[PDB]
């Protein structure tokens, strides 16, 4: 099995994705469990994914009832309930919106530049392994006792 998960975060939040960490992202956006099976890859992408008028494409969830079970996608963006009262769609106070946006710009500091992160979660099954490593060698000789 290979699972390639992918997203783009701020710079300073790139340490919140590891076995153990909690905060905004691990609790409300992307839960990675504390004994997972792969590697985490990231690299800085501020020269590409931002422009001088900003870029308000990338979003993130900033509100939830509870945490995530690890590896659980959620997309439901209905209006959050904070206070003890009905909401029925209508809002203004103690009914806030759970999706916030990003505002990447190419004048920022390192702590806010958009980093590209890909998660490789891999393991075996009892099925035949459809993913091996490298082999290697040198050359082929003839008429010689060789191993």
């Amino acid at each position: 099995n290979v699972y390639a998960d992918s997203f783009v975060i701020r710079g300073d939040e790139v340490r919140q994705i590891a076995p153990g960490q909690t905060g905004n992202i691990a609790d409300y956006n992307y839960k990675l469990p504390d004994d997972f099976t792969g590697c985490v890859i990231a690299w800085n992408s501020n020269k590409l994914d931002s422009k001088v008028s900003g870029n308000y494409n990338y979003l993130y969830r900033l509100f939830r009832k509870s945490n995530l079970k690890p590896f659980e996608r959620d997309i439901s963006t209905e209006i959050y309930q904070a206070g003890n009262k009905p909401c029925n769609g209508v809002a203004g106070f103690n009914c806030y919106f759970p999706l916030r946006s990003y505002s990447f710009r190419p004048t920022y500091g390192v702590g806010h530049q958009p980093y590209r992160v890909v998660v490789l979660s891999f393991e075996l099954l009892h099925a035949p392994a459809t993913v091996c490593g490298p082999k290697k060698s040198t050359n082929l000789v003839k008429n010689k006792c060789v191993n």
Partner: protein, 597 residues
């Protein structure tokens, strides 16, 4: 069901939506300050209106539940700094009247201009028109002429606008439950709830007096040395038992006494040596100055400066294609963007103010982990106070030898240090009694224990006894003098430029003794010294999420202001000035107006 929970969610959305809008406003104003176009003016004003309307909406949302059920003080401090409304609960006519008063008071002062004695063609505005003739001249008559011409014009017309200003500001202050608007000015020093660290708004004022009372005799041992050294300067207008005539201090309305130095230089052919020509001679550049300024903060062991700061800052004027504002300012744009705006030339003074602004930049770098409501100094006076001490470290001669800007064979003796201490004491000492006097005056007038028919009397009733200054030309109730000063008309509090001084002379006392220095405090520096930087950065990183007294105890281990190291910084000056003033009288008599002359 509780209360802290909804406040937590409200703050969690409010920070996220506030830092974005503030970045929009800050980048707009920076782009105006680099390049002067009216398009940038209208974009900056639209950004400011967006950011102000957002603050208005969140604040009027916030008052639906009181502060009284928050027991995590990080949230309660934020909602207490948020929940004040002001003129929104005031009515629709009075706010427009108040803004009209503020605009008129600013435009009479700022755009004002007084003419000559019969010429429309050469008329003098304030800066730099009126200021030079009172800055460096010797005729008593034209200094009296300008000193009368400014106030007799401007203050009389600002007087009824000031009456309307105080009568509206007092009702506005009682509409926000601070009786005596000066108490509303003291409310930023109010600390409550943190036991063993508590404070009060009434506890402040006498503390200022209880910090002034030790500054007194040194000042007179300064002042007589000033006054007798005006004997050979203006050799008719000296009362050796008396105050000072207030148009002779080499400047405007009695705040800085630097321009007397060329008269009051003690030692003739032993100059206070400036090293600007040294940078001129061996091939320097504007960039090398700020490179060495970063090299100083490596030497204390602090964080370095981001590449995005060196990328888009401005450290050289654009020549002449564009018109650029060069008033040197450290600009924290927010969101990890820090820049420095300056039109630096090859000068030792630009080296020194480069360190003075870079200290501000380091202070902005330090607390950038707080909520957006709590990103500032812990009180109003800390920021310039931590900005100052890098200049005091960088002016040291051994620091100039270690950076190759002074030949390492050069010796230093006492007369150089006495000249240096005098040219420092003209800056530091002279501001304190005048600042105390002006803040005391405005506090009293806001208190309403001085009605409208004693104002321009009571000013001079303080000005002779506390500052040691007598007016030269009689004033009646046509005038209004405390309004001839820039921070009075522009509604700026003036208290901070007192307290700053006291704060700075605690800090050089506490940091620079920890780097194990020998000898006096005036030859001290933090260089190649890591524990000093650790002790400092444990204070700069805090923010304002704590009481400011805890942030003071983090450095010095006291909760107050002590002028006694200010005594220790000024020792050799004082112990030589006593043998100077051995042939004079100290103090002043208070009768002596020079129209009872």
């Amino acid at each position: 069901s509780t209360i802290e929970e909804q406040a937590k969610t409200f703050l969690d959305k409010f920070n996220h939506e506030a830092e974005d809008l503030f970045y929009q406003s800050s980048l707009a104003s920076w782009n105006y300050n680099t390049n002067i176009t009216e398009e940038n003016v209208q974009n900056m004003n639209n950004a400011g209106d967006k950011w102000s309307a957002f603050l208005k909406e969140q604040s009027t949302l916030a008052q639906m539940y009181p502060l009284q059920e928050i027991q995590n003080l990080t949230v309660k401090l934020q909602l207490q700094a948020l929940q004040q409304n002001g003129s929104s609960v005031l009515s629709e006519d009075k706010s427009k009247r108040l803004n009209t008063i503020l605009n008129t008071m600013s435009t009479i002062y700022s755009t004002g201009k007084v003419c000559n004695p019969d010429n429309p063609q050469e008329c003098l505005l304030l800066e730099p028109g009126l200021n030079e003739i009172m800055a460096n001249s010797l005729d008593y008559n034209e200094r009296l002429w300008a000193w009368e011409s400014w106030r007799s014009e401007v203050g009389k017309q600002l007087r009824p606008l000031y009456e309307e200003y105080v009568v509206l500001k007092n009702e506005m202050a009682r509409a926000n439950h601070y009786e005596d608007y000066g108490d509303y000015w003291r409310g930023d020093y109010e600390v409550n709830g943190v036991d063993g660290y508590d404070y009060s708004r009434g506890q402040l004022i006498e503390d200022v007096e209880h910090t002034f009372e030790e500054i007194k005799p040194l000042y007179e041992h300064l002042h007589a040395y000033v006054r007798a050294k005006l004997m050979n300067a203006y050799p008719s207008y000296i009362s050796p038992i008396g105050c000072l005539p207030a148009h002779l201090l080499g400047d405007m309305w009695g705040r800085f006494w630097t321009n007397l130095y060329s008269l009051t230089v003690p030692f003739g052919q032993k100059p206070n040596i400036d090293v600007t020509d040294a940078m001129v001679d061996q091939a320097w550049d504007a960039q090398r100055i700020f490179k060495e300024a970063e090299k100083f903060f490596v030497s204390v062991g602090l964080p370095n400066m981001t590449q995005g700061f060196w990328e888009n800052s401005m450290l050289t004027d654009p020549g002449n294609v564009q018109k650029a504002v060069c008033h040197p300012t450290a600009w924290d744009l927010g969101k990890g963007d820090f820049r420095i705006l300056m039109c630096t030339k090859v000068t030792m003074d630009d080296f020194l103010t480069a360190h003075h602004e870079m200290g501000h930049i380091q202070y902005d770098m330090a607390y950038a982990a707080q909520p957006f409501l709590l990103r500032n100094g812990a009180n109003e006076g800390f920021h310039e106070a931590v900005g100052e001490i890098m200049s005091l470290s960088a002016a040291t001669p051994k620091h100039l030898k270690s950076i190759g800007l002074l030949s390492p064979d050069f010796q230093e003796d006492n007369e150089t240090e006495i000249n240096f201490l005098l040219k420092q004491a003209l800056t530091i000492v002279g501001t304190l009694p005048f600042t105390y006097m002006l803040e005391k005056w405005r506090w009293m007038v806001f208190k309403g224990e001085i009605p409208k028919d004693q104002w321009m009397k009571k000013w001079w009733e303080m000005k002779r006894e506390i500052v040691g200054v007598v007016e030269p030309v009689p004033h009646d109730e046509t005038y209004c003098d405390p309004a001839s000063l820039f921070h009075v008309s522009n509604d700026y509090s003036f208290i901070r430029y007192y307290t700053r001084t006291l704060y700075q002379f605690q800090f050089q006392e506490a940091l620079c003794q920890a780097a194990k220095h020998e000898g006096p405090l005036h030859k001290c520096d933090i260089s190649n010294s890591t524990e000093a930087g650790q002790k400092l950065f444990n204070m700069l990183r805090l923010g304002k999420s704590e009481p400011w007294t805890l942030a003071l105890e983090n450095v010095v281990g006291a909760k107050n202001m002590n002028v006694r190291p200010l005594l220790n910084y000024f020792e050799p000056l004082f112990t030589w000035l006593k043998d100077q003033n051995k042939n004079s009288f100290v103090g002043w008599s208070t009768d002596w107006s020079p129209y009872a002359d």
